RNA sequence: AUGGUAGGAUAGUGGCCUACCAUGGUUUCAACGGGUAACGGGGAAUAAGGGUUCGAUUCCGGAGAGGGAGCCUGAGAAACGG
């Protein structure tokens, strides 16, 4: 269940679960706003705020708990070679417990007061 | 031209689907490859291994021999069937006679050299043809003729130029990153029948190209998991890299210093340097005190 | 010393660095180079100081005695020579331009709003690019809108929404102030909200959201942009 | 009735790594052989190192170079299959301000030969100086050069507009007077420059066929003479 | 002399300690200011020119809330019994954030009699806190970080907050 | 070393540190590793009104005040003004 540690967690919220509107054209899934997981580091119903940079990419690794690795890539144009060459740089982002995310699964990610030294972005929408 | 172009597209994907299915044989073979390297190496070490569990080892070695010879015959049979259907082997009459014959181990040995030699002649024809095909199509023949001859070698020629050096690439496949020690390896080197373990010739860990192959697996499996799902993208491939190196052979307590370290800390050798006999008694009456305690 | 100062390379080794003030330092401008270097109006900084002390010039309704007051976009400068009044404007060719304005258009100043926030004791406010804070604003204005300021008080006389169709001047970015100032708006990856501008010579080209400066309407805008 | 044309490189790619799992089965064969005289299994080791160079360096750089057109044939396979199913059912940028965008397109290639040729052609009076007013030191310095005139009216307009002088400091005067006068001793003679013909800057970049944006189609010249 | 600097760490690859700077004033990783119970002691620390952090070295009372009616009085401390992130912190009896500490909430009882007028079985609250008004040793957490606040704040545990924490007590 | 949560510390996100967990992360599209008076690069900067492509303008790679170690005040700082 949700209670799996030595301390109870609940966000202070600056309805028992305060909905927060993201802006930038986004809306919660109904599983997130009527969930039971607390997860104050999740970008919705939490103290962290989503703003600024956005990017979309493909999930490449989902092996471990509450963060995932996104492969985003482009056929990068080397000017001297006159060649579009594919280059991927897999960045790790946080995943909220509102989206059952597997590999593949085109998603959108954005900066969330970056969490632990490489987690710079956070999922906001699946497709 | 629309139907002729994309009928080949069915041929590409069915060759690519058949490409992924043979790596599933390559996935499921590794536990045999790992456990073969821990087998005894010499003739004498096999006999001492047969003494401990003599009746149990004899049925399994016969079961291993039956399962290997069954698997060896059908894999030659599939290689004959593949080269006939992909017009690699020009002699259909010889190849169709090999399929119906019950073959021993040495006849499967010699047919391996037959299928590899026919593949070798097919390879130098294909690799010279397609390297000419891409070089004429790219338009770089009229722009790169006089400056970069050492890099613009044909793909067949680029293969055999690395086949000048069997020596260095055979130093690659003895690299024992897995730290695998065979049975009675310590006895055989001490007896002279065969230490930096990082190069071990009797140990056969071909993991180096296999990790490249498993890197070639994850590159091809990602490109082939487009529609629904492929055979094995990362399941039992990265895990197969892990369990042979004991997932990481590391301890979290030894990392933080939460476990005791049996290593020399190089500044703290000799400031508090030892003393003379600092026991003011002669230490044998304290042995009587330790034997017969004044609390016990 | 960049080129938007529009100053010759001669007569000066160390350019006057602007001091702290109500604008970003890159499009900032001290009044000393406004008088003695672009209006050709004084000759030395010592009489530029004497200009400020004797209070015959003023900026935005305040006397503002400082050599290095930074000057932003279309500030109101008041001088006492035949009761003339001045306003800056941006040029296409990468420079500054000040021109005469009469006193009725000098009474107002149309400025873009920076941020909006509910403040102390539950009241709302809004801030602009020039540091001027207006409280109890229009609730229907959003980010990157504009407001007229009174120049006697700090309140509102006029305001228009940001939209697609009306004159939205460009300021900052790789471009700097093309006349025509509108096509439309759309989004982009990474942010960097796409704003397109069509000139009188009918060419469309994309910019960012922070360069929004809604200057008026087709036909009559609220600014008195001169003739080239 | 005709079989579909298989790709020969993919057959080699499939065939060579079919040659692997056979060759690695040998490696299991010698480790299971109690009478194995070669505990290193060198023969298959050379067999296994053989076919990887085909896989790593033979097929894979070719397959990467063919990757767009191999994908091209597969997507048109996908497109009929949706169409016949439908028939059966029936990135970064800058926006960064720079400096070299509004400087004049004159100073790099102002060419004195064409400006003198149009001076003779376009019948414009040219504001020539007087007879004795040109010379500078009665002697050693030259009579007058046109570049020296162009700098002089520019600095005296700077005098007559911004109302201030400028000094003769030795940091600038080491170059701005000395090699200027040493050039003026040997280049401008009798009021006319002659050293510029002995110079070796090629004059075709500022000219060719009177401008740039010249030839891609036949229409660019067609509306030129029209 | 403790470091809070980011370049001391290894990279995502694990780059081998590039050694760019040494320590400056700006990344001044301060000492851990662990407190204890006792007579109240305050340290004023000047950081960033005009920010005055308040180091609480010893503290004896706190402002702990009771959420079911929303009230908080001043209660004399007794001693910590559990902390989630540490165990020897409890034996040290150093009060950090989220530490479960005992109090003798007599004015909470005195407010209860001054608002209701009924004794505690010697509109209502659940039965598991009636086990220890007779004991007079009520449990409370810590809400604020005492190391920079110079203050001790918390709340009384409420409903499931007991039922998960005496489970973690035993 | 990677994340989880909690705590300490910070002006502040933060594995920055600590506690207890889960074992992971970056790679053939090259991770890691060998060469550079990197007095060499930087539109850094007008130009050079023809000295072939620059004669000239500047940013530039750091540490330190006899040497390690710690402290101190100031919106400035681990000061060569203790």
XYZ file of N, CA, C and O in Angstrom, chain D residues 26-145:
480
model
N 29.750 -25.890 -30.928
C 31.060 -26.532 -30.869
C 31.810 -26.218 -29.575
O 32.463 -27.098 -29.001
N 31.737 -24.966 -29.102
C 32.425 -24.591 -27.870
C 31.815 -25.293 -26.662
O 32.529 -25.636 -25.712
N 30.498 -25.507 -26.677
C 29.871 -26.371 -25.685
C 30.270 -27.826 -25.921
O 30.372 -28.622 -24.975
N 30.503 -28.197 -27.183
C 30.878 -29.570 -27.488
C 32.240 -29.951 -26.938
O 32.414 -31.036 -26.381
N 33.225 -29.058 -27.066
C 34.546 -29.396 -26.537
C 34.647 -29.271 -25.025
O 35.527 -29.899 -24.432
N 33.807 -28.458 -24.396
C 33.818 -28.399 -22.949
C 33.133 -29.606 -22.340
O 33.470 -29.994 -21.215
N 32.202 -30.217 -23.070
C 31.588 -31.469 -22.656
C 32.387 -32.694 -23.077
O 32.021 -33.810 -22.694
N 33.458 -32.519 -23.846
C 34.269 -33.649 -24.282
C 35.367 -33.926 -23.260
O 36.258 -33.095 -23.058
N 35.300 -35.092 -22.617
C 36.322 -35.501 -21.664
C 37.649 -35.842 -22.329
O 38.695 -35.717 -21.684
N 37.630 -36.264 -23.591
C 38.842 -36.569 -24.335
C 39.257 -35.435 -25.259
O 39.900 -35.688 -26.282
N 38.905 -34.194 -24.924
C 39.244 -33.063 -25.777
C 40.716 -32.691 -25.685
O 41.195 -32.270 -24.626
N 41.429 -32.816 -26.804
C 42.854 -32.521 -26.818
C 43.140 -31.028 -26.913
O 44.287 -30.618 -26.707
N 42.131 -30.207 -27.217
C 42.285 -28.759 -27.329
C 41.352 -28.109 -26.314
O 40.199 -27.779 -26.635
N 41.820 -27.890 -25.080
C 40.982 -27.217 -24.078
C 40.802 -25.727 -24.319
O 40.007 -25.098 -23.613
N 41.511 -25.140 -25.283
C 41.293 -23.756 -25.669
C 40.246 -23.606 -26.765
O 39.651 -22.526 -26.871
N 40.010 -24.667 -27.552
C 39.082 -24.689 -28.692
C 39.403 -23.575 -29.689
O 38.594 -22.680 -29.946
N 40.614 -23.647 -30.247
C 41.137 -22.554 -31.060
C 40.440 -22.476 -32.409
O 40.294 -21.383 -32.972
N 40.009 -23.623 -32.948
C 39.428 -23.662 -34.290
C 38.128 -22.868 -34.363
O 37.942 -22.050 -35.266
N 37.234 -23.067 -33.396
C 35.990 -22.304 -33.374
C 36.221 -20.884 -32.909
O 35.395 -19.999 -33.179
N 37.284 -20.665 -32.127
C 37.604 -19.307 -31.712
C 37.948 -18.457 -32.924
O 37.478 -17.323 -33.056
N 38.700 -19.030 -33.865
C 38.936 -18.348 -35.129
C 37.665 -18.308 -35.973
O 37.467 -17.375 -36.754
N 36.791 -19.315 -35.831
C 35.494 -19.272 -36.510
C 34.614 -18.167 -35.931
O 33.861 -17.514 -36.660
N 34.675 -17.966 -34.609
C 33.806 -16.988 -33.957
C 34.301 -15.562 -34.168
O 33.498 -14.635 -34.329
N 35.619 -15.361 -34.167
C 36.170 -14.045 -34.487
C 36.021 -13.749 -35.984
O 36.030 -12.585 -36.407
N 35.808 -14.791 -36.797
C 35.695 -14.617 -38.244
C 34.441 -13.831 -38.604
O 34.488 -12.853 -39.356
N 33.301 -14.260 -38.059
C 32.014 -13.819 -38.586
C 31.538 -12.542 -37.907
O 30.552 -11.933 -38.344
N 32.200 -12.134 -36.818
C 31.795 -10.900 -36.150
C 32.258 -9.682 -36.921
O 31.612 -8.633 -36.884
N 33.387 -9.803 -37.621
C 33.875 -8.717 -38.469
C 32.925 -8.515 -39.643
O 32.744 -7.396 -40.135
N 32.283 -9.597 -40.090
C 31.169 -9.485 -41.029
C 29.985 -8.790 -40.368
O 29.295 -7.976 -40.990
N 29.719 -9.114 -39.101
C 28.558 -8.543 -38.427
C 28.830 -7.118 -37.957
O 27.996 -6.225 -38.146
N 29.990 -6.884 -37.337
C 30.298 -5.551 -36.822
C 30.662 -4.578 -37.935
O 30.224 -3.423 -37.911
N 31.465 -5.018 -38.903
C 32.113 -4.092 -39.825
C 31.664 -4.304 -41.266
O 31.808 -3.404 -42.101
N 31.127 -5.480 -41.572
C 30.671 -5.754 -42.919
C 29.221 -5.392 -43.161
O 28.911 -4.646 -44.092
N 28.319 -5.911 -42.326
C 26.890 -5.704 -42.550
C 26.427 -4.397 -41.914
O 25.734 -3.593 -42.549
N 26.807 -4.175 -40.651
C 26.271 -3.053 -39.878
C 26.608 -1.657 -40.418
O 25.702 -0.804 -40.405
N 27.836 -1.331 -40.869
C 27.997 -0.050 -41.581
C 27.249 0.011 -42.901
O 26.816 1.099 -43.297
N 27.084 -1.118 -43.595
C 26.268 -1.120 -44.806
C 24.791 -0.961 -44.470
O 24.068 -0.229 -45.154
N 24.329 -1.637 -43.412
C 22.919 -1.570 -43.031
C 22.558 -0.189 -42.496
O 21.419 0.270 -42.649
N 23.522 0.492 -41.871
C 23.308 1.877 -41.468
C 23.235 2.803 -42.677
O 22.447 3.756 -42.683
N 24.038 2.534 -43.711
C 23.989 3.350 -44.922
C 22.762 3.040 -45.770
O 22.379 3.850 -46.620
N 22.149 1.874 -45.578
C 20.932 1.519 -46.293
C 19.675 1.731 -45.465
O 18.591 1.351 -45.918
N 19.798 2.342 -44.281
C 18.727 2.308 -43.289
C 17.512 3.122 -43.716
O 16.383 2.815 -43.318
N 17.718 4.165 -44.524
C 16.582 4.970 -44.961
C 15.775 4.257 -46.041
O 14.540 4.327 -46.039
N 16.441 3.564 -46.968
C 15.688 2.949 -48.056
C 15.182 1.561 -47.680
O 14.220 1.070 -48.280
N 15.815 0.906 -46.701
C 15.212 -0.291 -46.121
C 13.958 0.070 -45.338
O 12.971 -0.672 -45.347
N 13.981 1.217 -44.653
C 12.777 1.708 -43.991
C 11.737 2.156 -45.008
O 10.532 2.037 -44.759
N 12.192 2.668 -46.159
C 11.293 3.171 -47.197
C 10.426 2.060 -47.777
O 9.239 2.263 -48.057
N 11.005 0.874 -47.962
C 10.239 -0.228 -48.528
C 9.276 -0.805 -47.498
O 8.212 -1.329 -47.851
N 9.629 -0.712 -46.213
C 8.765 -1.264 -45.176
C 7.560 -0.375 -44.899
O 6.490 -0.889 -44.558
N 7.702 0.951 -45.021
C 6.569 1.816 -44.699
C 5.514 1.763 -45.796
O 4.322 1.961 -45.533
N 5.935 1.498 -47.032
C 4.973 1.297 -48.107
C 4.330 -0.085 -48.019
O 3.246 -0.307 -48.570
N 4.988 -1.034 -47.339
C 4.311 -2.279 -46.976
C 3.225 -2.020 -45.942
O 2.143 -2.616 -45.992
N 3.508 -1.130 -44.988
C 2.538 -0.758 -43.964
C 1.357 -0.010 -44.577
O 0.205 -0.212 -44.169
N 1.610 0.812 -45.603
C 0.566 1.693 -46.119
C -0.510 0.941 -46.902
O -1.680 1.335 -46.860
N -0.154 -0.130 -47.635
C -1.212 -0.854 -48.346
C -2.049 -1.644 -47.358
O -3.249 -1.848 -47.565
N -1.396 -2.149 -46.309
C -2.041 -3.028 -45.341
C -3.103 -2.285 -44.548
O -4.115 -2.872 -44.161
N -2.876 -0.999 -44.278
C -3.933 -0.165 -43.714
C -4.973 0.183 -44.772
O -6.176 0.213 -44.486
N -4.519 0.462 -46.001
C -5.431 0.826 -47.084
C -6.330 -0.338 -47.479
O -7.525 -0.151 -47.731
N -5.775 -1.548 -47.544
C -6.592 -2.704 -47.898
C -7.459 -3.152 -46.727
O -8.523 -3.746 -46.929
N -7.016 -2.888 -45.493
C -7.893 -3.088 -44.341
C -9.043 -2.090 -44.364
O -10.186 -2.437 -44.044
N -8.752 -0.842 -44.742
C -9.803 0.156 -44.907
C -10.707 -0.175 -46.088
O -11.906 0.119 -46.048
N -10.156 -0.785 -47.138
C -10.976 -1.210 -48.267
C -11.814 -2.435 -47.922
O -12.947 -2.568 -48.400
N -11.271 -3.343 -47.105
C -12.029 -4.521 -46.687
C -13.135 -4.137 -45.710
O -14.217 -4.735 -45.711
N -12.876 -3.134 -44.866
C -13.891 -2.665 -43.928
C -15.028 -1.955 -44.655
O -16.193 -2.055 -44.251
N -14.711 -1.238 -45.729
C -15.727 -0.588 -46.549
C -16.488 -1.615 -47.384
O -17.614 -1.369 -47.817
N 13.850 22.662 -34.159
C 13.684 22.163 -32.800
C 14.197 23.177 -31.787
O 13.481 23.566 -30.863
N 15.445 23.603 -31.967
C 16.057 24.609 -31.115
C 16.593 25.738 -31.982
O 16.975 25.532 -33.137
N 16.599 26.942 -31.416
C 17.086 28.123 -32.109
C 17.640 29.085 -31.070
O 17.636 28.803 -29.869
N 18.112 30.238 -31.540
C 18.746 31.208 -30.656
C 17.858 32.418 -30.370
O 17.559 32.679 -29.201
N 17.373 33.103 -31.407
C 16.804 34.452 -31.319
C 17.734 35.364 -30.514
O 17.352 35.986 -29.522
N 18.993 35.394 -30.939
C 20.062 36.057 -30.202
C 20.559 37.254 -31.001
O 20.923 37.116 -32.173
N 20.577 38.419 -30.362
C 21.017 39.639 -31.019
C 22.528 39.637 -31.191
O 23.273 39.299 -30.267
N 22.977 40.024 -32.382
C 24.404 40.084 -32.667
C 24.780 41.459 -33.202
O 23.963 42.385 -33.177
N 26.014 41.605 -33.684
C 26.520 42.895 -34.128
C 26.683 43.014 -35.633
O 26.401 44.078 -36.186
N 27.116 41.955 -36.310
C 27.412 42.022 -37.741
C 26.169 41.793 -38.595
O 26.110 40.894 -39.430
N 25.153 42.625 -38.376
C 23.933 42.587 -39.162
C 23.492 43.955 -39.648
O 22.658 44.024 -40.557
N 24.017 45.040 -39.080
C 23.607 46.380 -39.469
C 24.790 47.294 -39.762
O 24.604 48.512 -39.861
N 25.994 46.748 -39.894
C 27.095 47.532 -40.425
C 26.901 47.732 -41.925
O 26.166 46.993 -42.586
N 27.562 48.754 -42.459
C 27.391 49.105 -43.861
C 28.039 48.069 -44.772
O 29.113 47.536 -44.484
N 27.377 47.795 -45.894
C 27.926 46.900 -46.911
C 28.770 47.665 -47.928
O 28.648 47.485 -49.139
N 29.642 48.539 -47.425
C 30.540 49.334 -48.251
C 32.004 49.116 -47.909
O 32.812 48.864 -48.811
N 32.352 49.167 -46.617
C 33.740 49.289 -46.171
C 34.599 48.082 -46.519
O 35.822 48.220 -46.620
N 33.996 46.909 -46.701
C 34.785 45.751 -47.098
C 35.210 45.834 -48.557
O 36.323 45.422 -48.900
N 34.351 46.368 -49.429
C 34.648 46.336 -50.854
C 34.305 47.643 -51.560
O 33.818 47.618 -52.696
N 34.531 48.789 -50.919
C 34.532 50.038 -51.668
C 35.728 50.047 -52.606
O 36.876 49.912 -52.170
N 35.461 50.194 -53.896
C 36.466 49.973 -54.926
C 36.674 51.308 -55.634
O 35.715 51.889 -56.152
N 37.918 51.797 -55.665
C 38.156 53.140 -56.192
C 38.083 53.192 -57.714
O 37.907 54.277 -58.283
N 38.248 52.055 -58.394
C 38.252 52.082 -59.855
C 36.856 52.338 -60.410
O 36.685 53.127 -61.348
N 35.841 51.682 -59.840
C 34.482 51.899 -60.325
C 33.947 53.257 -59.897
O 33.175 53.876 -60.637
N 34.348 53.739 -58.716
C 33.893 55.049 -58.262
C 34.557 56.172 -59.047
O 34.022 57.283 -59.108
N 35.712 55.902 -59.659
C 36.302 56.870 -60.573
C 35.706 56.739 -61.966
O 35.611 57.734 -62.694
N 35.315 55.522 -62.353
C 34.707 55.312 -63.661
C 33.325 55.948 -63.736
O 32.963 56.536 -64.762
N 32.541 55.850 -62.661
C 31.258 56.541 -62.636
C 31.432 58.032 -62.388
O 30.517 58.811 -62.687
N 32.577 58.450 -61.842
C 32.869 59.873 -61.719
C 33.060 60.505 -63.091
O 32.600 61.625 -63.341
N 33.723 59.788 -63.999
C 33.877 60.277 -65.363
C 32.582 60.154 -66.156
O 32.313 60.977 -67.038
N 31.762 59.147 -65.850
C 30.619 58.837 -66.702
C 29.398 59.681 -66.355
O 28.763 60.257 -67.245
N 29.059 59.779 -65.067
C 27.776 60.328 -64.637
C 27.778 61.848 -64.515
O 26.900 62.395 -63.834
N 28.740 62.530 -65.158
C 28.912 63.983 -65.295
C 28.675 64.797 -64.022
O 28.191 65.931 -64.082
N 29.030 64.234 -62.872
C 28.837 64.912 -61.599
C 30.067 65.744 -61.272
O 31.184 65.210 -61.302
N 29.922 67.042 -61.015
C 31.041 67.814 -60.461
C 31.420 67.292 -59.080
O 30.560 66.919 -58.280
N 32.725 67.270 -58.805
C 33.271 66.419 -57.757
C 33.849 67.154 -56.553
O 34.439 66.490 -55.690
N 33.706 68.483 -56.481
C 34.187 69.325 -55.374
C 35.699 69.184 -55.165
O 36.171 68.772 -54.103
N 36.454 69.530 -56.201
C 37.905 69.478 -56.114
C 38.438 70.649 -55.296
O 37.833 71.723 -55.239
N 39.587 70.430 -54.661
C 40.200 71.453 -53.831
C 40.933 72.478 -54.693
O 41.044 72.340 -55.913
N 41.447 73.517 -54.038
C 42.148 74.578 -54.744
C 43.572 74.139 -55.087
O 43.992 73.009 -54.819
N 44.329 75.059 -55.685
C 45.648 74.718 -56.213
C 46.666 74.576 -55.091
O 47.320 73.536 -54.955
N 46.824 75.613 -54.280
C 47.822 75.552 -53.236
C 47.351 75.021 -51.907
O 48.180 74.692 -51.055
N 46.041 74.906 -51.702
C 45.507 74.492 -50.411
C 45.676 73.004 -50.138
O 45.432 72.570 -49.008
N 46.078 72.220 -51.136
C 46.143 70.773 -50.965
C 47.344 70.354 -50.124
O 47.230 69.464 -49.273
N 48.499 70.995 -50.340
C 49.765 70.477 -49.824
C 49.852 70.662 -48.313
O 49.190 71.527 -47.723
N 50.685 69.837 -47.682
C 50.630 69.642 -46.245
C 51.831 70.244 -45.512
O 51.646 70.860 -44.455
N 53.048 70.137 -46.059
C 54.221 70.579 -45.313
C 55.232 71.337 -46.168
O 56.371 71.527 -45.721
N 54.836 71.776 -47.366
C 55.712 72.362 -48.390
C 56.880 71.426 -48.715
O 58.038 71.714 -48.420
N 56.560 70.294 -49.337
C 57.626 69.330 -49.505
C 57.313 67.868 -49.288
O 56.669 67.237 -50.130
N 57.861 67.325 -48.192
C 58.045 65.883 -48.008
C 56.723 65.125 -48.027
O 56.598 64.093 -48.697
N 55.730 65.612 -47.288
C 54.396 65.053 -47.401
C 53.802 65.375 -48.760
O 54.068 66.427 -49.342
N 52.974 64.460 -49.260
C 52.473 64.533 -50.618
C 51.536 65.706 -50.852
O 51.195 66.473 -49.950
N 51.138 65.857 -52.116
C 50.307 66.983 -52.530
C 48.930 66.821 -51.902
O 48.559 67.616 -51.032
N 48.209 65.755 -52.269
C 46.967 65.344 -51.624
C 46.563 63.984 -52.169
O 46.703 63.730 -53.364
N 46.048 63.127 -51.297
C 45.415 61.889 -51.720
C 43.933 61.951 -51.377
O 43.535 62.607 -50.411
